[PDB]
Assembly symmetry: D2
Homo-oligomer: 252 residues x 4
């Protein structure tokens, strides 16, 4: 019951971190609208979780987002929290292998998709003194090799989170982000499978953290529920969920 | 029950932020040892809260700290979380008004007191896979006018928190800090009373945050319970509880 | 002679910060290619400065950028430093007043324009062990009111700078950025003129810094010459040229 | 001639980074007072460099510092820049191997020594609109394994630098710090010699940077001359001279 009576929209909620966030909020008593552009994960989740329902929505299609918000209000009567988790990490690409076209496409998903849902949802979040939680990345703050476009998209997300927190603070709407590090998800697993030695890549990924393992979507979920339900003097913050990857010297 | 069965030591727990942290952990099901060098607040708190008990301890006196830890283990049989909240902010002092003697005294309380309890407690925290939470300050990261020694003490706390998180991560002991901003406490109130216009000073303190108010000890308490009970992939982090004071342009 | 024999491209070099950067590099002995999409400032600068020449180039038009690089090499035979200063700050806009269309347009100038020149120039910078300097902003790191799209563009620039520094470090190409704060430029002056009380807005802008004044383009120029000529163990850094605006408490 | 006519005090200037800083400032036209508690390096440097002279001074002995400042003024008639470089890094020590006594001793050198010279010098720096440059460390911001006391001392230095920049900005005195990473110095070499495999330790130290080498004292010197002579809109900043060690993922 930490977030009972509340209504939460999670984008990219059908698998991975989003699915962990969906589960965290349901376990806290909220009703959750799972947004995802693929049917498979989200529809199963909705069958599994009383209190979660699934609405197909591609966050890069404005009308989809418009319909997502209006369906949430029509079905549930309020909107308290928006979690902008939908995003993608391309495979490793050297700078000269990137293109301005792929860059823009990544910006559409990772940055503009977050911007659009937030914009359409803020009128309802103002009425509920709700809050916005963006899922960014540690590599927006510290960089990453072979990921110029992706790093750039997360740099904008973290900064935009602080700018929005300024604009919306007079209206009681808090805006925060979570910067996860290595989190074991289908995306991390997909990228590993494209490496020459997948198990070497995964073992390297675990050791990149002092804690010696990768994170779990459930641990990002717990951070998200904290930001929504118990962090009322927190706005514009970047909550690091990284196992300490940013600390200390390493092999670069 | 988020931290049921756990044993927590909070220093400076008799009033202010510490008292908020004590209450947060009791409400989460932990048993709490209130450490404080003044009897008044802590003994009242212990009478008020089933599950909290009070042990007089001056964190700058090593033998007091030694006895604090041994009493906690003898009475409760385990130690899961140490909250190093005991600390002090001197009144405003221009650089030339400070002295190397007052600086050292402040370092004894704000930095070495935290170091000593952490050192004596870590053997028990290793057995319990417990965690350490230091209460630092936003002004360690961004500075503050007329507070060179105080800012320095909190700079060391935040950095030490990251160094300790590195050393202790192989042993499963997480080490994090909270950086509060303006939190309305007896200390904030005492400092205001020394200003020519106390109500002007307090009104200025509220507006230094975009949220337009100061924080409450209970909100630092919620952040502390989160770090202890739900943040298992978080180590070496600095959790900002500031109402957004670090964001954006202001009058300097 | 600190950068004698070197060839520098400065975008947005016809006025403002860019013009200060152009002048700084000419004074250091480099030859400078002034890139700008307006003729007026840059052509005057080229007449004024032996060693600086002007090439019309809109950094959002790829073929313009392609021609800019090929003209620089054809005329000067090498390329050592690229300064991505071309950028724009829209007038104040509340979040709900922004659009996804204006956002993309701003991303084209502030982020993709920087990306394109850097990409086309890196092959020549690799041959010369040259370096890249992006002009970002303090408000990418700390946010700003009524500037969600602009803040986002600078968030991506700072992050991209770190990602590129990683990719290019094995090839001896350093990549850094400068984050200016309030710098008195025609852009700052234009924005002030749209305020109800322009002189109030400017006076507020000066006081937002502890130093009590805004910065000068020449001071950003000095920082840029330092990064190019003397900072060979610096890569991926964010050099703050802000008069201390990010320090301490203020009125928010 | 970038700093001609100016008078600079460098502590710990007899070898290592300090010696690089001394040489940088002499090459810029300043007269330099080499402060060091060992005679050997500093006296040789003074014989070698016209414009540099050597004064024996232990920065932890207040009367030594008092005499250092009065000798500088008596001999040279002004004081423009103070570089607080004297400091020490203990050998690797696990947390439980440290003591509150060694911690205090380290604080005396790394933090209080910097504080004392700065205090005694500020009256003269105010008359000259001079500036203060503290040599801190990257590991104050990101931590380091087996160096709790050392990391803490540098955490306080960086924070104190920002607090002092606030207090002194109304008086025209800028206060900045440099955070070097791995710099090849006699201290780095001494620590390596205590490792089981010294050449393995050094090779590991080079690879901890994306640039693939350690830094040179001359590169810290160049950063210091920049902060003194050309960075007049910079105060309270932390100039990273690290070869990019803080960027990206590594082996932790
Ligand atoms: N280590 C990590 O995996 C890691 C670290 C830092 C940040 N992140 C971020 O966490 C978020 C989730 O990543 P993940 O690892 O869970 O990935 P994932 O690939 O496992 O899941 C992402 C989900 O988003 C959905 N999605 C993708 N594009 C969408 C669109 N246009 N509209 C709607 N839904 C869309 C996908 O269908 C999928 O269900 C992303 O923003 C990612 O950048 C991940
Ligand atoms: N705005 C704020 O008040 C604020 C902001 C940032 C950080 N902090 C930090 O929060 C912590 C608590 O501050 P507060 O505002 O609650 O202050 P407070 O003065 O209201 O309470 C501090 C408590 O610590 C106790 N204490 C002091 N010295 C001690 C010692 N040597 N041994 C044991 N106990 C000791 C006092 O008796 C008191 O009960 C401090 O570390 C402070 O620096 C406060
Ligand atoms: N306080 C400040 O003014 C401040 C602070 C932080 C960052 N910045 C950044 O500094 C840079 C310069 O800003 P300024 O204040 O000097 O502005 P400015 O408006 O005075 O000058 C910018 C110049 O860039 C040119 N330009 C614009 N769009 C271009 C394009 N598509 N192609 C080529 N040239 C183009 C303009 O013609 C102009 O000459 C920008 O990136 C800005 O965001 C400025
Ligand atoms: N990689 C690095 O070596 C590195 C990285 C970051 C920061 N730093 C900092 O750079 C500074 C210089 O380090 P270094 O590597 O050049 O070390 P170093 O040991 O080679 O030289 C330090 C000098 O300071 C002098 N000194 C020591 N204690 C003193 C005292 N009490 N009074 C006066 N002089 C004293 C010594 O005699 C010596 O000449 C230190 O503050 C250190 O923490 C070094
Ligand atoms: O596998 N990924 O998609 C991934 C790994 C680490 C990150 F920090 C990140 O943003 C994304
Ligand atoms: O009132 N104080 O003691 C106080 C106020 C603000 C801070 F950030 C702080 O560390 C302490
Ligand atoms: O006036 N400007 O365009 C302006 C002012 C301050 C900033 F930090 C900035 O990026 C832009
Ligand atoms: O060898 N050292 O003393 C050393 C190495 C790296 C650091 F960042 C440092 O502060 C000190
Ligand atoms: Na359901
Ligand atoms: Na009790
Ligand atoms: Na010319
Ligand atoms: Na000499």
């Amino acid at each position: 019951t930490r977030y009972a009576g509340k209504v939460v929209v999670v984008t990219g909620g059908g698998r991975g971190i989003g699915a962990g966030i969906v589960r965290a909020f349901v376990n806290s008593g909220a009703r959750v609208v799972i947004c995802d552009k693929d049917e498979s994960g989200g529809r199963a989740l909705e069958q599994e979780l009383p209190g979660a329902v699934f609405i197909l929505c591609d966050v890069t299609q404005e009308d989809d987002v418009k319909t997502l918000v209006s369906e949430t209000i029509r079905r549930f009567g309020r909107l308290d929290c928006v979690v902008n988790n939908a995003g993608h990490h391309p495979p490793p690409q050297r700078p000269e292998e990137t293109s301005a076209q792929g860059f823009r496409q990544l910006l559409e998903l990772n940055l503009l998709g977050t911007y659009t849902l937030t914009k359409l949802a803020l009128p309802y979040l103002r009425k509920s003194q709700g809050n916005v939680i963006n899922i960014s990345s540690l590599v927006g703050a510290i960089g990453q090799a072979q990921a110029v476009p992706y790093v750039a998209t997360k740099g904008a997300v973290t900064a935009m989170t602080k700018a929005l927190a300024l604009d919306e603070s007079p209206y009681g709407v808090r805006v925060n982000c979570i910067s996860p590090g290595n989190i074991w998800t289908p995306l991390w697993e997909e990228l590993a499978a494209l490496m020459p030695d997948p198990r070497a890549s995964i073992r390297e990924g675990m050791l990149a953290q002092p804690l010696g393992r990768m994170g779990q979507p459930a641990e990002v979920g717990a951070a998200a529920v904290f930001l929504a339900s118990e962090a009322n003097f927190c706005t514009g913050i970047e909550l690091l969920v990284t196992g300490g990857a940013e600390l200390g010297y390493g092999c670069k």
